[PDB]
Design a protein around this nucleic acid. Structure first.
Ligand SMILES: [K+]
Ligand SMILES: [K+]
Ligand SMILES: [K+]
Ligand SMILES: [K+]
Ligand SMILES: [K+]
Ligand SMILES: [K+]
Ligand SMILES: [K+]
Ligand SMILES: [K+]
Ligand SMILES: [K+]
Ligand SMILES: [K+]
Ligand SMILES: [K+]
Ligand SMILES: [K+]
Ligand SMILES: [K+]
Ligand SMILES: [K+]
Ligand SMILES: [K+]
Ligand SMILES: [K+]
Ligand SMILES: [K+]
Ligand SMILES: [K+]
Ligand SMILES: [K+]
Ligand SMILES: [K+]
Ligand SMILES: [K+]
Ligand SMILES: [K+]
Ligand SMILES: [K+]
Ligand SMILES: [K+]
Ligand SMILES: [K+]
Ligand SMILES: [K+]
Ligand SMILES: [K+]
Ligand SMILES: [Mg+2]
Ligand SMILES: [Mg+2]
Ligand SMILES: [Mg+2]
Ligand SMILES: [Mg+2]
Ligand SMILES: [Mg+2]
Ligand SMILES: [Mg+2]
Ligand SMILES: [Mg+2]
Ligand SMILES: [Mg+2]
Ligand SMILES: [Mg+2]
Ligand SMILES: [Mg+2]
Ligand SMILES: [Mg+2]
Ligand SMILES: [Mg+2]
Ligand SMILES: [Mg+2]
Ligand SMILES: [Mg+2]
Ligand SMILES: [Mg+2]
Ligand SMILES: [Zn+2]
Lengths: 53, 245, 68, 91, 114
RNA sequence: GGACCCGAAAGAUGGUGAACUAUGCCUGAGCGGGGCGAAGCCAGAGGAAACUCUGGUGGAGGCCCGCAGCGAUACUGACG
RNA sequence: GGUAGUAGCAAAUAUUCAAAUGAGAACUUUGAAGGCCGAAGAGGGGAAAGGUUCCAUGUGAACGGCACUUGCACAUGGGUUAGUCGAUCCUAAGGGUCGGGGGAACCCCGACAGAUAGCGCGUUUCGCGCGUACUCCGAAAGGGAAUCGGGUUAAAAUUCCUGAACCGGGACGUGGCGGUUGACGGCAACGUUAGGAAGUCCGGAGACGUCGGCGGGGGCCUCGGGAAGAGUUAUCUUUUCUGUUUAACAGCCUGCCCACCCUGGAAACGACUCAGUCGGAGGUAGGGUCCAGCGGCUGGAAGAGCACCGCACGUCGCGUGGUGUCCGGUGCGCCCCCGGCGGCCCUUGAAAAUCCGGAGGACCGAGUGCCGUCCACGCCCGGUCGUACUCAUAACCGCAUCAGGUCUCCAAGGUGAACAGCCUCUGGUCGAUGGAACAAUGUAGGCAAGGGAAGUCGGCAAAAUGGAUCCGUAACUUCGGGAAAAGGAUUGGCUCUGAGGGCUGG
RNA sequence: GCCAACUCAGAACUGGUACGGACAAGGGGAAUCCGACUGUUUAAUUAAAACAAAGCAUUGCGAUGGUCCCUGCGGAUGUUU
């Protein structure tokens, strides 16, 4: 099979996890589209309710 | 020179009623000995929606008078009835909402619905949601009763005709504005192909007496004869008057 | 397919008329005995090879035996 | 926070159909979507299933009522008239 | 990323043309027909499911295909009415008969008095 | 009378088409990702009270941008 | 005939090198290179429609708008295998009818004017009891009895081969089960492979809209480690790539979200979801029952498939042997299925065949055999027709190998909000007659100093604006909007800092 | 102690001020006329102010009936009120 390596993708993932390529000039979707606040609220509610329990 | 829409209605085949999802005709029990002389008890099992009909319908189960089986009926629901309620039909049934009684046993001033015209026809009058008939007076001599119909007309019917105590449920439906064509579309989708309606003055002369002209206008009196032939009888038929009150 | 968990039931199944053949498979950690009947194939798993040899010796004379 | 000054439920219609029609339909929109007291089980669990049909979530009883309210105004008057007539007949 | 095709000459995604993806011992993915979800027996009085009976297609309940214990409940009206409904029916029958006897004896006493 | 030859727009009679298109009915199938944020609900602040305000939650609409689908405004473009 | 060897062959990025065959090669085949389709495809299948176009061999002429050694052309042969996939069965909108009513008649209405078909029990084949005028057509997408891997052809396969299952029907034999004539256990939910029964009656499944959130399962995607092979290696790279599999069916286990049962009796109210909601009509709590599963283990089943490493014939052994197929993580990810809530309706979103269950108990048997038995095993059978192939920038229609039209299933990586655009992997493909030149005029696509609509009927066309983050936003208003009003600022790379979680352990 | 994900917000340094570097992707404002709006329309010269629409109003009708089809017989509205 023809070569299609994932090394560049993995290196980009590492750089992103380090915080690279995440500025305002690298964003196309809105904050909601990138990560809905509903998801964050659900996560927070689950975490806090589990802690209280 | 073309058959007009009103004329084409009668042939049907696109103007027939839409009855695929209907639950069957709503009517009283067939008049029999028990209802003529005593009373027969039934139990309301379900209150259901009948597509194309504003009033809800009630499923009632009766014990067959002389057979070992269940007698299932579908009545037009009167407001206030509920599942598990006992329904009594007959001459000796108590005067309570939901019971079906012969008009001879209903005192004057009572409110009734689904009133029979002929003894045993199982109900033809005051069947729509929020509608009712009022018993006016009884005539023992000729065995007839006078009632007031929803339209205000007073009709004399034999005192043996049956009627259900109370008014038809679902009243007040027409007071809510629809606000949009889609609601009317949904309403008439289950009734018949009678919507939308095209104004006669919007047509060409060939297909309507109101058609034609360089301006939109009827061009002659919109009041037509009672004996005007089909295709010519359009507008306000046999109007005794027109305009505001 | 069905599994027989007892050597006694395995012998009972093998004794009946409709038992056609018996297949013995030698796995690393156990020995499998398979009997072909009319409706089902019955497999008995024996963890110890000594009891497997005893069972092989105990197979009815009239039943065909194959080694896998 | 106060999301709407006066629209309330009819805010779903936006700026369509006119203020008067929105105000007129507000009453029906509120009433038909509200919970009603159940006489049979003493709970506020009666909800409209279809026009004129009102079922209780708790005890499962289903009642035939008004198109957009559990009890129409004329229903009480009809009940009172029928009760009076029945009492007169029984007496 | 193997892409699949229908195994039968049905080419539309209807309710009766459902499938699952299964990996065969040959190392390839393949479709397999799956039966439509069916609701099990329901109690007409309460409207809730009848316990002790699996939810299968009507033909899967056939006697030759399903064991008797799986399609039966050991109680009066077993498999048809729920336990609470049966209890209510029994209590109602008993109390109504008792009240009928009470009415009869009351009528007899009233007739004797008059 | 076919009436020197050829020629109408029409009229009549009897049949054939809803595989295109129009409409009703039955039974199936299909339609990214985003924006605005109505009811209902939670908490807090101000106030003598009435009541008002704030921050969240939720996801309504013949609502908006827009992919597929459906359609076809302009170039009065190409072709003609 | 002239027109005239003239008009034309120009959309869908693109070909090149060597070799083979052949009289003849830009166009056939092999290999290499350079490109395209880019998963809502130029890939892999079906429905309709076509009808042999499918596969092998060969080829004068015609045709394949240049050419051909070639082929969807021509000629000679071959090819479509079913109890399990469909039709077949059911009924939908509707269609066709008896009788009756009309009609000169062809015909019209259509169960509406009427001694219905018949259906069960026992039998001297006769008796008894039920019997509301169509037991007909109508869906290769509605409903619905049953099959799975592995292998195999030039061309067929869930149809052929092997192995392993299932469904329907028939008849008996053995064993087992009940007789307290018609089982046992659990307080209960209910459990156990069996465990009476006829007319009559009743319930359920089949059986159903749409939208939104959340949760579970299968497949895919993705990260790490172990081993096997391959790629790069002037330098670096324990790194880059590939594959590391488990079908129907049988048993056991498990028991989501709900639902249900037992104990008990709650305000200082508590429990609880993303959202809701629930509780003296009995919550919280403790303990249980049941339901789904495309969940787990085992049999099937490693003997198979795949990868790798060897010996051998070396013209025809579909030959012979070994090693491995292992252990974890992660998620508003994508496709499908399921569960449970919530929103919407003057819209409430089929029927029947068929199957299961239940109410009743006429009637029925014996003492070492009788009467029953939906239990297990054993035995026999399973009709007719369709099945090749294309499904389209040449296999359907459009007079054609026409840039049009024609229903639907599957759907990888990167960027990115994104089945947007752009690039890539699997698969496919370079098929649009070729060569030389680079005049005018055109078609399509750009740029242009200074001015900026003076052009023109008219700003037609083009240009300008555009994503995201922060600040800010007027008149008017049906108070819902206007609104992305308007108007401002920022955006790369690199190195860091801070915040936002899960499991285990008293 | 062992694991886990990509979101958000800040700070230095740095490049010819480049940085939504391709792709992707509103021009905006002040008024007049018509139609309320969404929807529909002359397949192949007109998409519009035309049609429809919710809202408003009028007319007939209680079944031995209103409207309509049919040569006749009988039918549609009507599983209706
Ligand atoms: K005419
Ligand atoms: K219409
Ligand atoms: K109109
Ligand atoms: K006119
Ligand atoms: K006018
Ligand atoms: K059971
Ligand atoms: K002449
Ligand atoms: K057609
Ligand atoms: K349709
Ligand atoms: K040749
Ligand atoms: K006749
Ligand atoms: K007929
Ligand atoms: K079918
Ligand atoms: K096989
Ligand atoms: K259906
Ligand atoms: K719903
Ligand atoms: K299967
Ligand atoms: K029984
Ligand atoms: K075939
Ligand atoms: K086809
Ligand atoms: K100008
Ligand atoms: K001018
Ligand atoms: K729209
Ligand atoms: K519009
Ligand atoms: K337009
Ligand atoms: K109009
Ligand atoms: K009529
Ligand atoms: Mg997103
Ligand atoms: Mg006018
Ligand atoms: Mg058609
Ligand atoms: Mg737009
Ligand atoms: Mg797709
Ligand atoms: Mg060929
Ligand atoms: Mg006849
Ligand atoms: Mg039949
Ligand atoms: Mg919605
Ligand atoms: Mg991924
Ligand atoms: Mg092996
Ligand atoms: Mg019984
Ligand atoms: Mg033709
Ligand atoms: Mg991304
Ligand atoms: Mg006539
Ligand atoms: Zn209640």
């Amino acid at each position: 099979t023809k070569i299609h390596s994932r090394s560049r993708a993995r290196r980009m993932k590492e750089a992103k996890r380090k915080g690279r390529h995440s500025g305002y000039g690298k964003r196309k979707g809105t904050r909601e589209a990138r990560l809905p606040t509903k998801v964050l609220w659900m996560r927070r509610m689950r975490v806090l309710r589990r802690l209280l329990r | 020179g073309r058959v007009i829409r009103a004329q084409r209605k009668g042939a049907g085949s696109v103007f027939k009623s839409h009855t695929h999802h209907r639950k069957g005709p709503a009517k009283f029990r067939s008049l029999d000995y028990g209802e003529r002389n005593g009373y027969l008890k039934g139990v309301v099992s379900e209150i259901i929606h009948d597509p194309g009909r504003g009033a809800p319908l009630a499923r009632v189960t009766f014990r067959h008078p002389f057979r070992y089986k269940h007698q299932k009926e579908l009545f037009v629901a009167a407001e206030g009835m509920y599942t598990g309620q006992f329904i009594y039909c007959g001459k000796k049934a108590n005067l309570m909402v939901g019971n079906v009684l012969a008009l001879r046993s209903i005192p004057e001033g009572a409110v009734v619905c689904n009133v029979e015209h002929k003894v045993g026809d199982r109900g033809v009058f005051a069947r729509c949601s929020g509608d009712y008939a009022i018993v006016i007076s009884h005539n023992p001599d000729n065995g007839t009763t006078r009632i007031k119909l929803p339209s205000g007309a007073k009709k004399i019917v034999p005192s043996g005709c049956r009627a259900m105590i109370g008014q038809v449920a679902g009243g007040g439906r027409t007071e809510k504005p629809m606000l949009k064509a889609g609601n009317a579309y949904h309403k008439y989708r289950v009734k018949r192909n009678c919507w939308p309606k095209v104004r006669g003055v919007a047509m060409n002369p060939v297909e309507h007496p109101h058609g034609g002209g360089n301006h939109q206008h009827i061009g002659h009196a919109s009041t037509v004869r009672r004996d005007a032939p089909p295709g010519q009888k359009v507008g306000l038929i046999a109007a005794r008057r027109t305009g505001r009150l | 397919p069905k599994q027989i968990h007892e050597i006694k039931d395995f012998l009972l199944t093998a004794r009946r008329k409709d038992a056609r053949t018996v297949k013995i498979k030698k796995n690393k950690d156990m020995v499998k005995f398979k009997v072909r009947c009319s409706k089902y194939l019955y497999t008995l798993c024996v963890s110890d090879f000594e009891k497997a040899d005893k069972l092989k010796q105990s197979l009815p004379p009239g039943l065909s035996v194959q080694d896998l | 926070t106060k999301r709407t000054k006066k629209a309330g439920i009819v805010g779903k219609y936006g700026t369509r159909y006119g203020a008067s029609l929105r105000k007129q339909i507000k009453k029906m929109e509120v009433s038909q979507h509200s919970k009603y007291f159940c006489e049979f089980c003493g709970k506020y669990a009666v909800k409209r299933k279809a026009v004129g049909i009102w079922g209780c979530k708790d005890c499962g009883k289903v009642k035939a009522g008004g198109a957009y309210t559990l009890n129409t105004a004329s229903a009480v008057t009809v009940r009172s008239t029928i009760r009076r007539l029945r009492e007169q007949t029984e007496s | 990323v193997q892409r699949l095709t229908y195994r039968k000459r049905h080419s539309y995604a209807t309710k009766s043309n459902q499938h699952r993806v299964v990996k065969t011992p040959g190392g390839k993915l393949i479709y397999q027909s799956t039966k439509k979800r069916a609701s099990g027996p329901k109690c007409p009085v309460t409207g809730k499911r009848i316990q002790g009976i699996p939810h299968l297609r009507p033909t899967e309940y056939k006697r030759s295909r399903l064991s008797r214990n799986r399609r039966t409940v050991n109680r009066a009206y077993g498999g048809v009415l729920s336990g609470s409904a049966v209890r209510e029916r029994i209590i109602r029958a008993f109390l109504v008969e008792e009240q009928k006897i009470v009415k009869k004896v009351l009528k007899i006493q009233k007739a004797k008095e008059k």
